[PDB]
Design an enzyme around this catalytic site. Structure first.
Site, PDB file in Angstrom:
ATOM      1  CB  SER A 131      -1.060  -0.055   1.080  1.00 56.21           C
ATOM      2  OG  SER A 131      -2.129   0.826   0.781  1.00 56.21           O
ATOM      3  CG  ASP A 175      -7.056  -2.332  -2.993  1.00 55.80           C
ATOM      4  OD1 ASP A 175      -7.684  -1.609  -2.203  1.00 55.80           O
ATOM      5  OD2 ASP A 175      -5.837  -2.579  -2.909  1.00 55.80           O
ATOM      6  CG  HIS A 207      -5.905  -2.312   0.655  1.00 55.57           C
ATOM      7  ND1 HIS A 207      -5.159  -1.914  -0.407  1.00 55.57           N
ATOM      8  CD2 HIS A 207      -5.375  -1.740   1.774  1.00 55.57           C
ATOM      9  CE1 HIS A 207      -4.219  -1.071   0.029  1.00 55.57           C
ATOM     10  NE2 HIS A 207      -4.344  -0.943   1.376  1.00 55.57           N
TER      11      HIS A 207
END
Length: 262
Positions: A131, A175, A207
């Protein structure tokens, strides 16, 4: 020269661990330049091996990405999973902290008290990050030190036309946090033409789909172990898992892109 471990197979890659048991050592949170973490390293080896830093995302601890530590260490890498200084650090800060963590891990090769003294080939460094940590990974991959990069469900605000290390992006189809259409997919398309690269989108992935320790471990193992083998160890026994199979025909891969052969 740098090849380690058995001749690979799909079953070998997809097993819970690689060939080695793994020891761990703590890096105190008081370390300068990042938030501490864990060095993971194999038992039952001789000589030096590549080193890898693994970094989490926004408001996320080291445990969010810890799977990658034993998974790769067990295949003949020294792998340091980390915390950042604060959960709120943004991608530029995270890139700086990856660099500090790499510098720290390299320093361990010659530290008198370090359990990984003499075990690291400090020319052979990789980074994995999730991320915002994946944005940070792409930034550091643009600098010309690291030899392999794996962003996991990356998030960032910049563009990545200067990445200069072989880069495998794991994308997570569903996501909602770092939607692939705004992050992972643009990032891959921005990567320049003079690197080896791959995009692996995990089918219906949240995610969290590429963090490790979920139902997607077969794809993460086959691609992620093979990437670091191929690019950190120059180990072409692993080419066969990256270039050759029709990756999209895997029911857990919803899209693949790449520029095989490597």
């Amino acid at each position: 020269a740098y090849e380690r471990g058995p001749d690979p197979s799909v079953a070998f890659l997809e097993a819970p661990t690689g060939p080695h048991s793994v020891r761990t050592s703590r890096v105190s949170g008081l370390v300068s330049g990042f938030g501490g973490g864990t060095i993971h390293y194999p038992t039952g080896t001789t000589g030096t091996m590549a080193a890898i830093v693994v970094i989490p995302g926004f408001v996320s601890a080291e445990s969010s990405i810890e799977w990658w530590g034993p998974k790769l260490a067990s295949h003949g890498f020294v792998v340091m999973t980390i915390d950042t200084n604060t959960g709120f650090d943004q991608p530029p800060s995270r890139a700086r902290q990856i660099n500090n963590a790499l510098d720290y891990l390299v320093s361990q090769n010659t530290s008198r008290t370090s359990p990984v003294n003499g075990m690291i080939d400090t020319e052979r460094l990789g980074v994995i990050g999730w991320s915002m940590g994946g944005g940070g990974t792409l930034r550091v991959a643009s600098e010309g030190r690291i030899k392999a990069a794996i962003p996991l469900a990356p998030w960032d605000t910049t563009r990545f036309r200067g990445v200069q290390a072989p880069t495998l992006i794991f994308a997570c189809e569903s996501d909602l946090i770092a939607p692939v259409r705004s992050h992972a997919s643009p990032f891959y398309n921005q990567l320049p033409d003079d690197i080896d690269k791959a995009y692996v989108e995990i089918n219906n992935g949240s995610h969290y789909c590429a963090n490790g320790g979920g139902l997607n471990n077969d794809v993460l193992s086959r691609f992620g172990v093979s990437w670091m083998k191929r690019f950190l160890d120059n180990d072409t026994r692993y080419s066969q898992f990256l270039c050759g199979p029709n990756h999209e025909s895997d029911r857990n891969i919803s899209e693949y892109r790449g520029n095989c052969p490597y």
